[PDB]
Each structure stands twice: as structure tokens, then as C-alpha cells.
């Protein structure tokens, strides 16, 4: 069933079905072997182009798409890399667009992040995706601004935190941000000053 609304509920229903580590595996196979994962990313890619070229129905569909990818990627193993490489590139592109959604893709991206060394593609995406627009003077504040400009809303931040929590778990590239800015991990922690400084003054416990 193709109708956009049926299609989105289908995605949601399957997410529910994906529950066990075991079920999640089947859901993985369902798309991979006997709609394919590729079709799914394609849809996301297409929406991305339409969104940017343009500059509720879509939110329904996209939100569902993400809800599903998230559910499985979380409950999976070596398979995670396979989905990772593939939604990773597309998801990154989607994040660049404004979207309401930003947070959600960040949550999914995080699920994709692997335990090992091959974090690097992800860190580059994140740094590039904060760094790109911002103009950084030689001081600290300008760096904070880069993050603040991009991570405008609450969902954006929570998603960002989940992704960061995952990447920071155990590793990252040397001389990160080289070329564009003063390198290193430090500015990210500064950003948290913006966050947990503020937290005390939340809304909404």
C-alpha cells in the first residue's frame, strides 16, 4: 500500500514488530531481502532535494521513516554497519536542511555510530555540518555561536547531545576541524556552557 499515509503507518507498525534483538534482525532482512532499505533512503534523499529546492504530510512520512530506522538500528549488531553504509550519508544531508526532524535524524545517526575507530566519517559530518556557516575569529564566543546558530531549538539540542554522547563514548580524530578552525574537541565542551549552565532555568522538569 502506496498511499502516503498508509505507507507511513506501515513504517510505524513494523517498528513495533522489530522489538526483540531477534525480531529486529528479521526486520533487517525483510527490507534487505524478501521495499528495500535503499528505497527508504532514496525517499529521504528525494524529500531532502524537494525541501531545499523549494526554499504536515511530509512530516508524517519523514517522522515515520526515522522512527523505523531508529528502532532497528538500535536493536542490531554487525548489521549496524551495513545500514550505516545506506543511510549515513543521506541522513547527514537531511540534517543540513532546517526541518522541524533535525533532532530525530540526530537520534538515528547516533544509533548508527559504531563502537570502533570508524567514527571518523561521523565526526567530520558533525564538525562540518556547526563549522560550515560560522565565521570564527581568533574569540571563544564565535565558536559557541557556531553551535548556537545551528542548534536553534530544543529538539535540535537534545538530538545533538545524544549523538555527541555516542561519539564521545571512547574516541575521535586528531586535529579535528583542521583547516577551518582552531582544532580539537574543546569547543564542543564550551558549547555545553551554553547548555548546562540555563538547564537550571528550563521551562518542564
Amino acid at each position: 500500500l502506496l498511499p502516503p499515509t498508509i505507507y507511513i503507518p506501515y513504517l510505524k507498525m513494523l517498528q513495533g514488530l522489530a522489538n526483540g534483538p531477534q525480531c529486529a534482525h528479521y526486520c533487517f532482512s525483510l527490507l534487505k531481502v524478501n521495499v528495500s532499505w535503499e528505497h527508504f533512503f532514496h525517499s529521504l534523499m528525494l524529500y531532502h532535494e524537494h525541501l531545499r529546492k523549494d526554499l504536515q504530510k511530509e512530516q508524517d512520512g519523514l517522522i515515520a521513516f526515522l522512527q523505523l530506522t531508529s528502532t532497528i538500528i538500535t536493536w542490531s549488531e554487525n548489521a549496524r554497519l551495513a545500514l550505516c553504509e545506506t543511510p549515513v550519508v543521506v541522513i547527514l544531508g537531511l540534517l543540513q536542511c532546517s526541518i522541524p526532524l533535525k533532532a530525530e535524524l540526530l537520534k538515528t545517526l547516533a544509533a548508527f555510530g559504531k563502537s570502533p575507530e570508524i567514527a571518523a566519517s561521523l565526526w567530520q559530518s558533525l564538525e562540518y555540518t556547526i563549522l560550515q556557516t560560522v565565521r570564527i575569529p581568533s574569540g571563544i564566543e564565535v565558536e559557541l555561536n557556531e553551535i548556537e546558530s545551528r542548534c536553534e531549538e530544543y529538539p535540535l539540542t537534545r538530538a545533538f547531545c545524544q549523538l555527541i554522547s555516542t561519539l564521545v563514548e571512547s574516541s575521535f580524530p586528531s586535529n579535528l576541524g583542521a583547516g577551518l578552525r582552531p582544532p580539537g574537541f574543546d569547543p564542543y565542551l564550551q558549547f555545553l556552557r551554553d547548555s548546562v549552565f540555563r538547564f537550571r532555568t528550563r521551562a518542564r522538569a
Binding site: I136, P137, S138, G139, I140, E141, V142, E143, P182
Partner: protein
């Protein structure tokens, strides 16, 4: 103070500093022009400025 505890440098500021001096400068000049006009007016009939 905050900006100083940053990486460093300041820039593209000079242009403004130029703008204000540039905007300021003519103001300087209007005065001079005023200082001339009055002199010219002053150069004009003697023995009685106070006449009708």
C-alpha cells in the same frame, strides 16, 4: 573582556573606524567653511557696524 578570552585578533573593525572618521571629517570641514563665510561677511563697511 569576554572577547579577549578568545582565540584572538579583531578585525574588519577598522573599516568602521574609518567610516566614523570619514563621517566625522566633513563635519570638521563644515565648521571651516562656516569659519570662512563669517570672515567674508566680516570684510564688508566701517565707521558704524550698529547703523541701520
Amino acid at each position: 573582556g569576554t572577547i579577549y578570552l578568545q582565540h584572538a585578533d579583531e578585525e574588519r573593525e577598522k573599516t568602521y573606524k574609518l567610516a566614523e572618521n570619514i563621517d566625522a571629517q566633513l563635519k570638521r570641514m563644515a565648521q571651516d567653511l562656516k569659519d570662512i563665510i563669517e570672515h567674508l561677511n566680516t570684510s564688508g563697511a566701517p565707521a558704524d557696524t550698529s547703523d541701520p
